[PDB]
mmCIF file with all atom_site columns, C-alpha atoms in Angstrom:
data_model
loop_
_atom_site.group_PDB
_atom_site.id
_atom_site.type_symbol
_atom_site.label_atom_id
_atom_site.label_alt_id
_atom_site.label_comp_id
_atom_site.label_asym_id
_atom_site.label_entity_id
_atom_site.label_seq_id
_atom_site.pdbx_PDB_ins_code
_atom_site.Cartn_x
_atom_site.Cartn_y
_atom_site.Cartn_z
_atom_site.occupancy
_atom_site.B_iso_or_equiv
_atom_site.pdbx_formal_charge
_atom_site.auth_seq_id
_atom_site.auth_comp_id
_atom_site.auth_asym_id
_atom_site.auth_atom_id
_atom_site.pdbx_PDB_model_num
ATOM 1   C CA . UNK F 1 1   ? -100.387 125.305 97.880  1.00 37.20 ? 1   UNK F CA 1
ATOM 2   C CA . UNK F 1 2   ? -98.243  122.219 97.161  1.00 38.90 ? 2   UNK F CA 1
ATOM 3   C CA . UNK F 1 3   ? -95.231  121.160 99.385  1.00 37.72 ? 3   UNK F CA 1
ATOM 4   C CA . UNK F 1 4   ? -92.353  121.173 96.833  1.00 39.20 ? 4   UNK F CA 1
ATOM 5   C CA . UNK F 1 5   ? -90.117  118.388 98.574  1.00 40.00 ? 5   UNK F CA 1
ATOM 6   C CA . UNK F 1 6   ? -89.424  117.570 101.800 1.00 41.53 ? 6   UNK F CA 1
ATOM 7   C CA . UNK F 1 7   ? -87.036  120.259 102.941 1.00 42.83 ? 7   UNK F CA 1
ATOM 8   C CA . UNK F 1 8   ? -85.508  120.786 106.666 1.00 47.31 ? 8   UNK F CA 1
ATOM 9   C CA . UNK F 1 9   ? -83.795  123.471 108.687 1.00 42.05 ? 9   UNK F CA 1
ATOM 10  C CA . UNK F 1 10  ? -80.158  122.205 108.647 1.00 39.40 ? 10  UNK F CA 1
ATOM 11  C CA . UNK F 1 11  ? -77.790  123.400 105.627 1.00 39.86 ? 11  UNK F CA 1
ATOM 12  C CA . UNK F 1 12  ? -74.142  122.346 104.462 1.00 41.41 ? 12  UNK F CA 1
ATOM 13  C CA . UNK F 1 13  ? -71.425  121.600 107.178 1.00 37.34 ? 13  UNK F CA 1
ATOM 14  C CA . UNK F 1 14  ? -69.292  123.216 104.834 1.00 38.22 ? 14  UNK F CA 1
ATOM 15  C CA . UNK F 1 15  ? -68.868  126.117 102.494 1.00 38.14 ? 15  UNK F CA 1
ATOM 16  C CA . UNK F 1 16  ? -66.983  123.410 100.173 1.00 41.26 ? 16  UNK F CA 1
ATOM 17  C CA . UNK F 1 17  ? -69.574  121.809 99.199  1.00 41.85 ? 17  UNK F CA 1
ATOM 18  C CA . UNK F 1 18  ? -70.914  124.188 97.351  1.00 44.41 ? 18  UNK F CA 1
ATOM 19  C CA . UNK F 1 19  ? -71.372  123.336 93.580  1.00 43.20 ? 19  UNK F CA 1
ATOM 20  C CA . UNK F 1 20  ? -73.126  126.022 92.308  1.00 43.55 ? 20  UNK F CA 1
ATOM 21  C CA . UNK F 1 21  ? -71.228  128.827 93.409  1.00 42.52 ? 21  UNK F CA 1
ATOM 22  C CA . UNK F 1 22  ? -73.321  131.400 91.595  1.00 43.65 ? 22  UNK F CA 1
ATOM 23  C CA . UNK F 1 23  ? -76.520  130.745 93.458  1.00 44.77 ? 23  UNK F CA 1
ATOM 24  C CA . UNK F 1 24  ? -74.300  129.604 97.056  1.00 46.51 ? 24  UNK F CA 1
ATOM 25  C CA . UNK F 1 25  ? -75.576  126.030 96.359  1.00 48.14 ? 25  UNK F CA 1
ATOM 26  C CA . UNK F 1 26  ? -74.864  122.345 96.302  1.00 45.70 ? 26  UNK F CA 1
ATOM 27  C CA . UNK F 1 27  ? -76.709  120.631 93.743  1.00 41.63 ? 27  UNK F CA 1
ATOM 28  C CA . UNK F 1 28  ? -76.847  116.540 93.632  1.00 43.58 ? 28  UNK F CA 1
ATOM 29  C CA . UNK F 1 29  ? -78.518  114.782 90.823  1.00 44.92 ? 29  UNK F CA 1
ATOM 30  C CA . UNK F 1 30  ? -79.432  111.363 91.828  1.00 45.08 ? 30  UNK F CA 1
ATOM 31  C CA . UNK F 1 31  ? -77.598  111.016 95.155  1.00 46.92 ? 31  UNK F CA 1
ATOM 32  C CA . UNK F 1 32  ? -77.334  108.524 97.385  1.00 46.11 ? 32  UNK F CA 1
ATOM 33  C CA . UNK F 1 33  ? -77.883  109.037 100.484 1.00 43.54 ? 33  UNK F CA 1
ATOM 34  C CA . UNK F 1 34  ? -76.382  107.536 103.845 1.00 37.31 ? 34  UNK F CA 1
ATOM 35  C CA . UNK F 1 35  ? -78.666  108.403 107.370 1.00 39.22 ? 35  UNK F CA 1
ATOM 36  C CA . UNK F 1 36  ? -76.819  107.839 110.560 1.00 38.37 ? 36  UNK F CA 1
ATOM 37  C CA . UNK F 1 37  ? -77.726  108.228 114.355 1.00 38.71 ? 37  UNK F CA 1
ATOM 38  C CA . UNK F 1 38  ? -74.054  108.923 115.131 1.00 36.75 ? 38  UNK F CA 1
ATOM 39  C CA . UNK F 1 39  ? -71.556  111.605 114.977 1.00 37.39 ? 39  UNK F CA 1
ATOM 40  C CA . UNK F 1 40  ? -69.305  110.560 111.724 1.00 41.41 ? 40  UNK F CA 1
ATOM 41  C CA . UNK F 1 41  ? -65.479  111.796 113.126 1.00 41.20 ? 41  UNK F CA 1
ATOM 42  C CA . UNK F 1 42  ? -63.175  108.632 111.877 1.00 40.52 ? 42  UNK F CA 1
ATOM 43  C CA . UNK F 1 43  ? -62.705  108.592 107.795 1.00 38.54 ? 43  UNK F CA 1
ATOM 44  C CA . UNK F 1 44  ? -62.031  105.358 107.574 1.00 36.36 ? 44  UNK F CA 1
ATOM 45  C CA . UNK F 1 45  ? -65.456  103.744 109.109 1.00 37.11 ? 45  UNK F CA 1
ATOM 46  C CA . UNK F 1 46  ? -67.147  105.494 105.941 1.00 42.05 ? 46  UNK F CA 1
ATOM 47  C CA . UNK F 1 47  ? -64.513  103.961 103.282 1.00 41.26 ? 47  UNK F CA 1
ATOM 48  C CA . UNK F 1 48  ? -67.285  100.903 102.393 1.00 42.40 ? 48  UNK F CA 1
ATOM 49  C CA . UNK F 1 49  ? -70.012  103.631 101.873 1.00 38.25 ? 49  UNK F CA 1
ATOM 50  C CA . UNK F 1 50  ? -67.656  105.640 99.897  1.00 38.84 ? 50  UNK F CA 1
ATOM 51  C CA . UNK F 1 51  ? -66.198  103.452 97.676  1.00 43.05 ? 51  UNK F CA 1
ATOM 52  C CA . UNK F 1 52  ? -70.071  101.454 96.687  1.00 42.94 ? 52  UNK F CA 1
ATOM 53  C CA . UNK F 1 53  ? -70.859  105.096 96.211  1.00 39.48 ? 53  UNK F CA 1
ATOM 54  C CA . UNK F 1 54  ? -68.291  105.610 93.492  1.00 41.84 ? 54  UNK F CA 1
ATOM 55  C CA . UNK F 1 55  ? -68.906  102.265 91.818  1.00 44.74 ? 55  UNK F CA 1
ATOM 56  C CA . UNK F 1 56  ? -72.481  103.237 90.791  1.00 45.74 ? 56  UNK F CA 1
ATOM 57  C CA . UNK F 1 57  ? -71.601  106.395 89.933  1.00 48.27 ? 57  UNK F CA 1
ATOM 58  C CA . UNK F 1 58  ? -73.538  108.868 92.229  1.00 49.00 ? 58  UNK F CA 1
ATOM 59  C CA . UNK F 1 59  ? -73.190  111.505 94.325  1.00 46.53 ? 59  UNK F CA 1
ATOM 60  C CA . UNK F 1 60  ? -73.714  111.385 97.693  1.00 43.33 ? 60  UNK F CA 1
ATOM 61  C CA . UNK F 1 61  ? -75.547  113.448 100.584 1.00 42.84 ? 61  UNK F CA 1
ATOM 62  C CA . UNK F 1 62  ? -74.544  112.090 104.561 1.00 44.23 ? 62  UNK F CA 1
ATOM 63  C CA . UNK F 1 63  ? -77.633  113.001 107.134 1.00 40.34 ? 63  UNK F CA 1
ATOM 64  C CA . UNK F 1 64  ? -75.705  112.320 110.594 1.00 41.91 ? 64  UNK F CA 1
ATOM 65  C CA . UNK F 1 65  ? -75.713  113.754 113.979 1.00 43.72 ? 65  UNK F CA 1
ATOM 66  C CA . UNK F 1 66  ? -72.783  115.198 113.004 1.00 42.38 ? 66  UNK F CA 1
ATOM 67  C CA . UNK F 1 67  ? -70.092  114.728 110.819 1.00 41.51 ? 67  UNK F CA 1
ATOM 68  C CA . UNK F 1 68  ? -66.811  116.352 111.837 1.00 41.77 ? 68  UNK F CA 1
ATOM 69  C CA . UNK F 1 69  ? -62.870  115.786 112.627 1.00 41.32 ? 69  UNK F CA 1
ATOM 70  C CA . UNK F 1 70  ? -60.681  113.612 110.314 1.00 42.82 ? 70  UNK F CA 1
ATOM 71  C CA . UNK F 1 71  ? -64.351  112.215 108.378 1.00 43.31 ? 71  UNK F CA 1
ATOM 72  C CA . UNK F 1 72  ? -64.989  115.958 107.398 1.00 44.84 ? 72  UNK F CA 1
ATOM 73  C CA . UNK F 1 73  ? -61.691  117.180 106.837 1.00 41.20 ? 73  UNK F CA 1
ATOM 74  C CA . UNK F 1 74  ? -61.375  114.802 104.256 1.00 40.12 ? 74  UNK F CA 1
ATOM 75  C CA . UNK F 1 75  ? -64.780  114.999 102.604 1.00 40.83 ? 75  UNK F CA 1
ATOM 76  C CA . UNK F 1 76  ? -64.088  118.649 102.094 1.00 41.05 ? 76  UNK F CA 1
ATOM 77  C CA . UNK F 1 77  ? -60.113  118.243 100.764 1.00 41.67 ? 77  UNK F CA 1
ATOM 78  C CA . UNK F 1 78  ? -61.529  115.324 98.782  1.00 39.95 ? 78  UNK F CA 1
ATOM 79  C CA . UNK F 1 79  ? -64.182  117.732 97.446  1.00 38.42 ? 79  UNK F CA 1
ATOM 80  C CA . UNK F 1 80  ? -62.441  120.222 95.969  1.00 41.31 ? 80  UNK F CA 1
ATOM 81  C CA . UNK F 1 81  ? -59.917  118.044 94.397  1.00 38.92 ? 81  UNK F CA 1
ATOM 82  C CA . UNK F 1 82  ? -62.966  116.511 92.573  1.00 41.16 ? 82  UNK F CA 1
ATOM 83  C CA . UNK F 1 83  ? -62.279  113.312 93.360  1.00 39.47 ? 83  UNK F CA 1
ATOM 84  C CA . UNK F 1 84  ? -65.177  112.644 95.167  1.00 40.05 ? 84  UNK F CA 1
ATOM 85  C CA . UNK F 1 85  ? -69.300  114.127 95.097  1.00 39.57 ? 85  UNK F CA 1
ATOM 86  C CA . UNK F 1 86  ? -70.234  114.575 98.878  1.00 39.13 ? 86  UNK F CA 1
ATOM 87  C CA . UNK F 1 87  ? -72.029  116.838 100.675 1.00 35.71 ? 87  UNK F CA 1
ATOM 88  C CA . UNK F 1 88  ? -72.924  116.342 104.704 1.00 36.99 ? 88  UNK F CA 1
ATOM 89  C CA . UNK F 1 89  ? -75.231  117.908 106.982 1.00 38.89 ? 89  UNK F CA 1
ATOM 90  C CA . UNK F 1 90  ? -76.791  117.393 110.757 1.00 42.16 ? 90  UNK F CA 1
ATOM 91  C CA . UNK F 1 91  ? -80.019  115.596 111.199 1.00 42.85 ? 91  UNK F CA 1
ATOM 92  C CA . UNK F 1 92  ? -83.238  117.837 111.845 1.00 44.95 ? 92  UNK F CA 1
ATOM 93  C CA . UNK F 1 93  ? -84.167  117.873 115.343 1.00 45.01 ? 93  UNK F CA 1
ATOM 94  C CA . UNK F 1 94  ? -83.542  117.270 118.990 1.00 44.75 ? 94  UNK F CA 1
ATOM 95  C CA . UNK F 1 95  ? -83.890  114.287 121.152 1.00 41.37 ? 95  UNK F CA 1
ATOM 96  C CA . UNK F 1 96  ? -86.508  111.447 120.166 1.00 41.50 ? 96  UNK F CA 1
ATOM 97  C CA . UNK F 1 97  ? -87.752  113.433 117.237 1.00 39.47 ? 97  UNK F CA 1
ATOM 98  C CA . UNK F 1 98  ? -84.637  113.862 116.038 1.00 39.91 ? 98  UNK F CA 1
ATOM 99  C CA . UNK F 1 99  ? -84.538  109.535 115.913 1.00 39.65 ? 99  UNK F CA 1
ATOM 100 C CA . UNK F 1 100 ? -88.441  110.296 114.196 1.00 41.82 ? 100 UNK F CA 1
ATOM 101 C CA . UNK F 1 101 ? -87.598  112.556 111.424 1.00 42.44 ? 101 UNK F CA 1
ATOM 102 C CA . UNK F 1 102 ? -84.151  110.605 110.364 1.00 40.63 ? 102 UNK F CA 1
ATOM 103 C CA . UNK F 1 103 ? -86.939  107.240 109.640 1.00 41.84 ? 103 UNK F CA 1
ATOM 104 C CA . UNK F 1 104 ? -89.074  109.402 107.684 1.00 39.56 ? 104 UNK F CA 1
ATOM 105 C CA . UNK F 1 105 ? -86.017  110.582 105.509 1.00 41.45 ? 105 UNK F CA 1
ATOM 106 C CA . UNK F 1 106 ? -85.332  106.748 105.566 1.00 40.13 ? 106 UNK F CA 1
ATOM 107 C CA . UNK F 1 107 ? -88.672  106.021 104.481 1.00 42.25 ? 107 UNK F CA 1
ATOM 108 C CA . UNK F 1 108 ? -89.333  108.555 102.124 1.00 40.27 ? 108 UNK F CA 1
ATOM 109 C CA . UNK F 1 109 ? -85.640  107.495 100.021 1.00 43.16 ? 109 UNK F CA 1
ATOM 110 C CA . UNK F 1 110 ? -85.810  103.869 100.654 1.00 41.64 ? 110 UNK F CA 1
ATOM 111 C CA . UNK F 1 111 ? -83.199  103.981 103.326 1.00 43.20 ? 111 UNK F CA 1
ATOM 112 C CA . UNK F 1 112 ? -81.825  102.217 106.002 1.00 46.58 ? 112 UNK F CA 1
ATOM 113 C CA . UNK F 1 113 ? -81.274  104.374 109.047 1.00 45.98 ? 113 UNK F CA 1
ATOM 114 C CA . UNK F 1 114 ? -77.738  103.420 110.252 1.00 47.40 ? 114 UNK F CA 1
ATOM 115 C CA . UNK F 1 115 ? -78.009  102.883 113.885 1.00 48.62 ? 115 UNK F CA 1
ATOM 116 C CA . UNK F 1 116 ? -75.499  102.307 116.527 1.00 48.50 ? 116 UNK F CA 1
ATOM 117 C CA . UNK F 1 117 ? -78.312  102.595 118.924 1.00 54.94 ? 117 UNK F CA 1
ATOM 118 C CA . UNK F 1 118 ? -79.277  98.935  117.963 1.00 53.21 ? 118 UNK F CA 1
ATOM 119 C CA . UNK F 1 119 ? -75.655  97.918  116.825 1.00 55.04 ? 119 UNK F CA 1
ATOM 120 C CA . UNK F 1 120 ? -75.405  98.575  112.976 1.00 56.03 ? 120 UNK F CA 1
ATOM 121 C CA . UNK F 1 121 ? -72.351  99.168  112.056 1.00 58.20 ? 121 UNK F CA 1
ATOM 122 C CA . UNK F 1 122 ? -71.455  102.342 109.258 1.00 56.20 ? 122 UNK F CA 1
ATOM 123 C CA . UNK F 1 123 ? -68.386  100.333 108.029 1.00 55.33 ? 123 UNK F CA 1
ATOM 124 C CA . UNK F 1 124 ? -71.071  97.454  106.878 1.00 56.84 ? 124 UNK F CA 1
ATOM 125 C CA . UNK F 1 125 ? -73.927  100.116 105.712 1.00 50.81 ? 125 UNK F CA 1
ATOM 126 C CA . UNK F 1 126 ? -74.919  98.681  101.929 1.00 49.88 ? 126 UNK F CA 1
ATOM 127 C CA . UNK F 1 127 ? -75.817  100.385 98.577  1.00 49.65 ? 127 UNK F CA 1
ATOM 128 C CA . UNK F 1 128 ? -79.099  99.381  99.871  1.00 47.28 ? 128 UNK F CA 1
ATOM 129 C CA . UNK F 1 129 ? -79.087  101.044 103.289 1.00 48.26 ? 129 UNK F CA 1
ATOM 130 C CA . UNK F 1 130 ? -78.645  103.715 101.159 1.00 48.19 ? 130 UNK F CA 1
ATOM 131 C CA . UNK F 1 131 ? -82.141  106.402 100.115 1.00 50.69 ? 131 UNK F CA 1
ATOM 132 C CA . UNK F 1 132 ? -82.184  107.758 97.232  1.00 47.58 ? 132 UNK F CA 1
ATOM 133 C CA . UNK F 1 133 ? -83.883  110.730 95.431  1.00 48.55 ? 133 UNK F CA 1
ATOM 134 C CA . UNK F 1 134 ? -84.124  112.620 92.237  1.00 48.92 ? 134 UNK F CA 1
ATOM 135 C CA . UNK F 1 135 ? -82.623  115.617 93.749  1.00 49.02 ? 135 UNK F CA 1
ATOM 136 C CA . UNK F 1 136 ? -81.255  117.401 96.670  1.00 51.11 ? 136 UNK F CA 1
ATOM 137 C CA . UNK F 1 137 ? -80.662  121.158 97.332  1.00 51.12 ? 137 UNK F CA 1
ATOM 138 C CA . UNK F 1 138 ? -78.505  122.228 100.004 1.00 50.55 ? 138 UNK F CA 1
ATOM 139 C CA . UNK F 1 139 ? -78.220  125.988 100.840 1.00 49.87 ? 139 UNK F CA 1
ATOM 140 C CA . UNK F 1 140 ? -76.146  127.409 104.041 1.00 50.08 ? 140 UNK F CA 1
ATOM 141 C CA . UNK F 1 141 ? -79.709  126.999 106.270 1.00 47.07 ? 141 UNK F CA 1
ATOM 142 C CA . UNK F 1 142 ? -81.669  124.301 104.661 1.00 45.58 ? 142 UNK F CA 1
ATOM 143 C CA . UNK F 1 143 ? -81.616  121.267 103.197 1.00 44.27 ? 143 UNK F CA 1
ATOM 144 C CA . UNK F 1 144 ? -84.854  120.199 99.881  1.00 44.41 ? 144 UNK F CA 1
ATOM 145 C CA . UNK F 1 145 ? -85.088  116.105 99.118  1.00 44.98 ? 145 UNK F CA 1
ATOM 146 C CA . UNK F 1 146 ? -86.917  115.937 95.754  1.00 45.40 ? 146 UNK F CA 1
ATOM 147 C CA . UNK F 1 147 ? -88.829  113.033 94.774  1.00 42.62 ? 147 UNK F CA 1
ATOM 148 C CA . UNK F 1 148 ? -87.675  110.256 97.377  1.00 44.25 ? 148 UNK F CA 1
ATOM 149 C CA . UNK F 1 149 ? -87.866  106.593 95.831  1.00 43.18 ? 149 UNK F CA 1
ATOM 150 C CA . UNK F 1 150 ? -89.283  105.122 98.560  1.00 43.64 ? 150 UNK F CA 1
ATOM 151 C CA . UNK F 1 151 ? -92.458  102.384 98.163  1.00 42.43 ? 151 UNK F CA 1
ATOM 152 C CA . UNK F 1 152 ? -95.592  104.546 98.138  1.00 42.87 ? 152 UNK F CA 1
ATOM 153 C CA . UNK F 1 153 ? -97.026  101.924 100.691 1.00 40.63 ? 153 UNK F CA 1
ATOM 154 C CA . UNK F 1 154 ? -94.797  102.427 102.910 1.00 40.71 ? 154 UNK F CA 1
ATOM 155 C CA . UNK F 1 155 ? -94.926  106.465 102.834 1.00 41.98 ? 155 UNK F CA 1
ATOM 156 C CA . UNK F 1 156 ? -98.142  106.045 103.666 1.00 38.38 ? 156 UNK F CA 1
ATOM 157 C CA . UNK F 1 157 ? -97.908  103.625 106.167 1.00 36.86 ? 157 UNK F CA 1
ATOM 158 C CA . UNK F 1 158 ? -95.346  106.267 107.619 1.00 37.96 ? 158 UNK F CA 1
ATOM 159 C CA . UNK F 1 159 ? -98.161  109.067 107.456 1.00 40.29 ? 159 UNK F CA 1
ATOM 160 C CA . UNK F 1 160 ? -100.522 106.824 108.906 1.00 38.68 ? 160 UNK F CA 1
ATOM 161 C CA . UNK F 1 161 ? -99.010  106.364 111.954 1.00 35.89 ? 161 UNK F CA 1
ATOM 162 C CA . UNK F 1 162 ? -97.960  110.158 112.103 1.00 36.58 ? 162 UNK F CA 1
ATOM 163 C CA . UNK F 1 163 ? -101.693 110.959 111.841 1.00 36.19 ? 163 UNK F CA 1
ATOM 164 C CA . UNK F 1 164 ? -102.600 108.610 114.785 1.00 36.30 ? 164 UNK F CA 1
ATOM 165 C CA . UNK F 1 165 ? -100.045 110.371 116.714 1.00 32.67 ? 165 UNK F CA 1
ATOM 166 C CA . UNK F 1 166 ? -101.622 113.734 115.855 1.00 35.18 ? 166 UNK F CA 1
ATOM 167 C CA . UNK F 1 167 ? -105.303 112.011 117.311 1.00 37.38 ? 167 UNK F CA 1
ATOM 168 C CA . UNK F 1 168 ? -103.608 110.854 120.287 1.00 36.79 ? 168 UNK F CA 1
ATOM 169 C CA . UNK F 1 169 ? -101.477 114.054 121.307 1.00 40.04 ? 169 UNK F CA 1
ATOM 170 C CA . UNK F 1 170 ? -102.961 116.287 123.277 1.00 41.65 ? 170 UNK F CA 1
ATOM 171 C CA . UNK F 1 171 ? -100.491 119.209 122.858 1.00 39.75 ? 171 UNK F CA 1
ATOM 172 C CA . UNK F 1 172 ? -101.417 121.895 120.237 1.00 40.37 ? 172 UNK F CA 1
ATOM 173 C CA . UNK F 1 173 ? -96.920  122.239 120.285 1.00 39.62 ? 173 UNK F CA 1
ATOM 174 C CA . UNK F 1 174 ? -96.652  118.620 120.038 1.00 36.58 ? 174 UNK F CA 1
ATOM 175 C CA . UNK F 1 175 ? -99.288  118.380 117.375 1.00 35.59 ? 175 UNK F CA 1
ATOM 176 C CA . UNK F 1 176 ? -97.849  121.131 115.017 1.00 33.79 ? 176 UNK F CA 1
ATOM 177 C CA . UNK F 1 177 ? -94.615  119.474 114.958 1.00 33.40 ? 177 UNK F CA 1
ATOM 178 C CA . UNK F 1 178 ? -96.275  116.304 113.915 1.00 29.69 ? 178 UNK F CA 1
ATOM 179 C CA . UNK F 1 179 ? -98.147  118.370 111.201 1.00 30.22 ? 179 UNK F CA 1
ATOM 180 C CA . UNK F 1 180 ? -94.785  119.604 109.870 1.00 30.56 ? 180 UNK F CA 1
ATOM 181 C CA . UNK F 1 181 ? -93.672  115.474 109.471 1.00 31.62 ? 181 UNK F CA 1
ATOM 182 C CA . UNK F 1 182 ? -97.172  114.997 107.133 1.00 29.86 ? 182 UNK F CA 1
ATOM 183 C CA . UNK F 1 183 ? -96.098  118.137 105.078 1.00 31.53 ? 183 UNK F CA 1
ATOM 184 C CA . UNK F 1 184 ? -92.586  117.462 104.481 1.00 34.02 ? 184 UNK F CA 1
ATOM 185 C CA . UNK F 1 185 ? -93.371  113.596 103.449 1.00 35.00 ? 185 UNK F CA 1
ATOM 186 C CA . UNK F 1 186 ? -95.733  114.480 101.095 1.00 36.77 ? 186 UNK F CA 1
ATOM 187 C CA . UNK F 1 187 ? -93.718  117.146 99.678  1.00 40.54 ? 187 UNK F CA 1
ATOM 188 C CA . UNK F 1 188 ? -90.953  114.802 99.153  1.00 43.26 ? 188 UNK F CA 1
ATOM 189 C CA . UNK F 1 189 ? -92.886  112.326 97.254  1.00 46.96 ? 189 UNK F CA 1
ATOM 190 C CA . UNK F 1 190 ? -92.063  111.513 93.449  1.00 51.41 ? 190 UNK F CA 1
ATOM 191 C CA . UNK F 1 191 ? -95.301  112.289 91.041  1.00 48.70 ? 191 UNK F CA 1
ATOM 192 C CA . UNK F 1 192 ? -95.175  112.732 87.755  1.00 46.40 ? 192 UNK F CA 1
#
């Protein structure tokens, strides 16, 4: 049966970002969306993304390690006044596949991941860094990407090198996990 968008096990970091209260949802049409290796804690590091954000008029989803303190105190306050369209959850994962599965979201939404790891800077993250999709569905234990923008070419360059991985492991644990990468890239793909 058909994967229907790439969806992982990590839901809202807050109750208040929940837009479609009948159904315990958030609901973005057209987000942006920011990736970051890091723990988001200080508000004003994200005031570049926010603000390009609100120029073109879009919502936007954060995929971080963690996004907490003053950063997600405001988000939520900021929220519910309706003055801005956020929603934030943690990164899928542990470890390096954590790192793996943050590039495929990248991929998949024509994103740049932000990483501190090799000195990027979130206060100079672009519109472009940015991924985009046609939707995103956020429920208290999961989060659904719908039709990334990404190039095709380069979603399948992705799988490509996930499917040489899957040759060259030798672990049935480290293989299924691999599997899981194929399925949710392909389910996040735009057709139509």
């Amino acid at each position: 049966d058909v994967v229907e968008g790439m969806q992982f096990d990590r839901g809202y970091l807050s109750p208040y970002f929940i837009n479609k209260p009948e159904t315990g949802a958030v609901e973005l049409e057209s987000p942006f969306i920011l990736l970051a290796d890091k723990k988001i804690s200080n508000i004003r590091e994200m005031l570049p993304v926010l603000e390009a954000v609100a120029k073109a008029g879009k919502p936007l989803l954060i995929i971080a390690e963690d996004v907490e303190g003053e950063a997600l105190a405001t988000l939520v306050v900021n929220t519910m006044r309706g003055i801005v369209k956020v929603a934030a959850v943690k990164a899928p994962g542990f470890g390096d596949r954590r790192k793996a599965m943050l590039q495929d979201i990248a991929t998949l939404t024509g994103g740049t991941v932000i990483s501190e790891e090799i000195g990027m800077e979130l206060e100079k993250a672009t519109l472009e860094d940015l991924g985009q999709a046609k939707r995103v569905v956020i429920n208290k234990d999961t989060t659904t990407i719908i039709d990334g923008v990404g190039e095709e070419a380069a979603i399948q360059g992705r799988v490509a090198q996930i499917r040489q991985q899957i040759e060259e492991a030798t672990s049935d644990y480290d293989r299924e996990k691999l599997q899981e990468r194929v399925a949710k890239l392909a389910g996040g793909v735009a057709v139509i």
